A paper describes a structure:
Focused refinement of the LepRD3-D7-zip complex centered on the leptin–LepR interface yielded an additional 3.8 Å resolution map comprising leptin together with the three interacting domains of LepR (D3 and D4/D5), enabling molecular analysis of the site 2 and site 3 binding interfaces. At the high affinity site 2, the A and C helices of leptin engage several loops in the CHR2 (D4 and D5) of LepR, burying 750 Å2 of surface area. The interaction appears to be mediated in large part by hydrophobic contacts, such as between Leu13 and Leu86 of leptin and Leu503 and Leu504 of LepR. Moreover, leptin residues Arg20 and Gln75, which were previously reported to be required for LepR binding, form apparent hydrogen bonds with Thr441 in LepR. At the low affinity site 3 interface, the Ig domain of LepR (D3) engages the top of helix D and the CD loop of leptin, burying 775 Å2. The primary contact appears to be mediated by Tyr119 within the CD loop of leptin, which inserts into an aromatic cluster consisting of mouse LepR residues Phe403, Tyr405, Tyr409, and Tyr420 (“site 3a,” Fig. 3e, f). Immediately adjacent to Tyr119, leptin residue Ser120 forms apparent hydrogen bonds with both the hydroxyl of Tyr409 and the backbone carbonyl of His418, which is also contacted by the neighboring leptin residue Ser117. Comparison of the previously reported apo-leptin structure with the LepR-bound structure reported here reveals a substantial rearrangement of leptin helix E as well as loops AB and CD loops. This results in large part from a second site 3 contact site formed between the leptin AB loop and the LepR Ig domain via a primarily backbone-mediated β-sheet interaction formed between LepR residues 415–417 and leptin residues 35–37 (“site 3b”). Notably, Asn82 of leptin lies in near the center of the site 2 interface and makes key hydrogen bonds contacts with LepR residues Ser505 and Leu503, suggesting a loss of site 2 binding associated with the N82K mutation.
Residue numbers in the entry:
A (entry chain A): 332 to 425
B (entry chain C): 1 to 141
C (entry chain B): 427 to 630
């Protein structure tokens, strides 16, 4: 459950995401979530915000042009619980 | 063929396939502290001791690797198939005559994640397969 | 009688196989179509090569130098290939004596990058070092050549056997001038082929 799943914007402006995590039949709160990028980098806690009890909001700043990775041309960002990441992800395009 | 040449060839095969996984995974760098659900049928969470466990795990790895549509992945799958044949040669070399039984995969979840989670499946499979190969190299001696 | 020597070539990335063979004794057969058959094995080349009843065709292209050319893709690291030359015509069929080639035995590496040199003014031996290529992972032996700088070069040859040695020492005759050095590498056992030379690195 993501909204929106993808976005288009050239280098020179910020970014905005929204995720809600679903696990079995229980929905986790928002104060515990941590964001993830490409499963390689952890984003410091300054870069998040909470709109309400059930959504994690992240605003990036001064995004740089993404580097191609194999056949793939987008970078993926995952919302995960503690250290448990759901399979789905949002699409980042520059 | 002599057994020693076979063992040296096996060891070299593990080392080369590990190196290919490494330099193809440098652009796909991942951290071990991130667990993703929906891939419980991908192994790598337990140590591997017995021959049949290695055979079955490598067969599963080959299956998931050919489940991915890319040329380099095809090469990795081919190398794992050669590795499996080498391991079967070793198993028969050990002069143990337990009848060969193989197969038993019902991967509907595999197709689901492939059509839903291509990237995550690829990276997690590569990472866990590399870890498994390091475990086999550790326990081969 | 008919005889066709077979030569094969492998790139250093272990992703391409190239084989070449001479057409030097087929021109005298008017109307003779050419073709190639190759058979794969589970493991290793066998002791006595022979013709496998079931095979697989593969087309080859003609280049300008006068050699038939074709490739295999993808390749197998430890699988034996049995291939030969076959000629078809209107009075029967003749088969050439085959030859078995292991894919790992005809692999040559890339030249070693980052070649440097310097003159230790204190002692008198020339110091040079390299880095081994990423592939192949097997142990390799290196051969080194040095000489003066100018239009024509009166080279001198030397080698290093220890694969683990990334450094070398060499007796020289002049040190106030500038020398030239390059390197090349090959497998220790003997299989494969020499891998050119290295980029010209000029001393200071
Ligand atoms: C992006 O964020 C910066 C501050 O981080 C802000 O000044 C700017 O108005 C935002 N929007 C843009 C650049 O379109
Ligand atoms: C020498 O290197 C060039 C390019 O690096 C390559 O095209 C050539 O095939 C090499 N020589 C041999 C004998 O392979």
């Amino acid at each position: 459950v993501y909204f929106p799943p993808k976005i288009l914007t050239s280098v020179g402006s910020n970014a905005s995401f929204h995720c809600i995590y679903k696990n079995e039949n229980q929905i986790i709160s928002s104060k515990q979530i941590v964001w993830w990028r490409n499963l390689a980098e952890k984003i410091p806690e300054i870069q998040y915000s909470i709109v309400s009890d059930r959504v994690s909001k992240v605003t990036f700043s001064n995004l740089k042009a993404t580097r191609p990775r194999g056949k793939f041309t987008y970078d993926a960002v995952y919302c995960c619980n503690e250290q448990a990441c759901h399979h789905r992800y949002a699409e980042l395009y520059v | 063929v002599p057994i020693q040449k076979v063992q040296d060839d096996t060891k070299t095969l593990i080392k080369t396939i590990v190196t290919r996984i490494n330099d193809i995974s440098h652009t796909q760098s991942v951290s071990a502290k991130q667990r993703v659900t929906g891939l419980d049928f991908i192994p790598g969470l337990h140590p591997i001791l017995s021959l049949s466990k290695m055979d079955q795990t490598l067969a599963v790895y080959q299956q998931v690797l050919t489940s991915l549509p890319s040329q380099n992945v095809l090469q990795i799958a081919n190398d794992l198939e050669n590795l499996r044949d080498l391991l079967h040669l070793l198993a028969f070399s050990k002069s143990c005559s337990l009848p060969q039984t193989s197969g038993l995969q019902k991967p509907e979840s595999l197709d689901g994640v492939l059509e839903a989670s291509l990237y995550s499946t690829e990276v997690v499979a590569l990472s866990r397969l590399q870890g498994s190969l390091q475990d086999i190299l550790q326990q081969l001696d």
